[PDB]
Amino acid sequence: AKIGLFYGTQTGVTQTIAESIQQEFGGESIVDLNDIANADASDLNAYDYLIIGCPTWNVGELQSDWEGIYDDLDSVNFQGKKVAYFGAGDQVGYSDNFQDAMGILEEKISSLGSQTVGYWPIEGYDFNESKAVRNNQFVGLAIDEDNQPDLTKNRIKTWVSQLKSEFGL
Numbered sequence: 001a002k003i004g005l006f007y008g009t010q011t012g013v014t015q016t017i018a019e020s021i022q023q024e025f026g027g028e029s030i031v032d033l034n035d036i037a038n039a040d041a042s043d044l045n046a047y048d049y050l051i052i053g054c055p056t057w058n059v060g061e062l063q064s065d066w067e068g069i070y071d072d073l074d075s076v077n078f079q080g081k082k083v084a085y086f087g088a089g090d091q092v093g094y095s096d097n098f099q100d101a102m103g104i105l106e107e108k109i110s111s112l113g114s115q116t117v118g119y120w121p122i123e124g125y126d127f128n129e130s131k132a133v134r135n136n137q138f139v140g141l142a143i144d145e146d147n148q149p150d151l152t153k154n155r156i157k158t159w160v161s162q163l164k165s166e167f168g169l
């Protein structure tokens, strides 16, 4: 497929989100679903468009699978690639580290030369701090299944519509 979606998940929430995003784009012919646990950093070179999904764990940390491959990301040339991000988090229980993982990954990947696409508004959330916020916007789609499960479907539909334009679809 033209778009490669790489996700990491601990309790399965991020995977379900990834599956809905794939479905919203039109299926396997449009988006390849890849678990980062089974991937090598170089697998990311094969796509011009990437979607990175990662839930925040422990104290504002990367999901373990993303944690593992983090240092290897330096070996991938991201120049010219357009990358979107999404993450699962808990704004109530971790109000000081909401969606930190997504922020940590975007900081690293954008520093390697990629173009971030898919900024999302912060107004629909209530949190104190997040490493995923830049100039009053999230760097990617923030999902909260713990506190706002009723908003997920529409958030995904809206975000995917937004990305289609930016990914040339």
Ligand SMILES: Cc1cc2nc3c(=O)[nH]c(=O)nc-3n(C[C@H](O)[C@H](O)[C@H](O)COP(=O)(O)O)c2cc1C
Pocket (backbone or CB within 6 Å): 008, 009, 010, 011, 012, 013, 014, 015, 055, 056, 057, 058, 059, 060, 061, 063, 088, 089, 090, 091, 094, 097, 098, 099, 100, 145, 146
């Ligand atoms: C031990 C623990 C630590 C967590 N830490 C954070 C955090 O620092 N920031 C955040 O936004 N969410 C945090 N969360 C919420 C999770 O990211 C959230 O439950 C998410 O749906 C987990 O996704 P997964 O099933 O894909 O791994 C934490 C949850 C648990 C159980």
